[PDB]
């Protein structure tokens, strides 16, 4: 009997392979859609990052203050900051914290020269070399006082 049984088994197989081949077509389609999403997303972030970076450089020139990093604990929200301009010495870095919200100003000096330190020390009030605290209200005011003291 089994030449018949054999032709039948070929039928069954041909059909099994057909389902497989459609499933493959489907998966390849998904792979193509995701392959697209990836490439688009990759550009959209690189473009968003270049845009945000020029706007950052605008701010740094407009305001004479660079905000390169940010140091967030659960305690507060910190930023690394540099203010002033290059040539005496005219630039002052510090960290700002936000913590009933209050601002903590903390000086950063350890990467300086004693000469740079002397010029700063004379151009700036004594208390800009002490960790301070004060309300958000005074923040703008704070900014202006360092800006004046530098040029």
């Amino acid at each position: 009997l089994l030449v018949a049984n054999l032709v039948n088994e070929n039928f069954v197989l041909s059909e099994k392979l057909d389902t497989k081949a459609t499933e493959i077509k489907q998966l390849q389609k998904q792979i193509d859609s995701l392959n697209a999403q990836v490439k688009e997303l990759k550009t959209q972030t690189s473009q968003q990052a270049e845009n945000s970076e020029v706007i950052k450089d605008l701010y740094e020139y407009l305001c004479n203050v660079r905000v390169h990093k940010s140091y967030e604990d659960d305690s507060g929200l910190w930023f690394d900051i540099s203010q002033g301009t290059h040539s005496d010495y005219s630039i002052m870095d510090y960290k700002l914290g936000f913590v009933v919200t209050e601002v903590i100003y903390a000086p950063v000096l350890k990467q300086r020269s004693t000469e740079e330190l002397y010029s700063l020390q004379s151009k700036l009030p004594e208390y800009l070399f002490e960790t301070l605290s004060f309300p958000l209200s005074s923040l703008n005011q704070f900014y202006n006082k360092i800006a004046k003291s530098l040029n």
Binding site: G76, L77, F98, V99, T101, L136
Partner: peptide, 8 residues
């Protein structure tokens, strides 16, 4: 979820 610095 908590912002110390207020929003713009």
């Amino acid at each position: 979820k908590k912002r110390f610095l207020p929003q713009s």
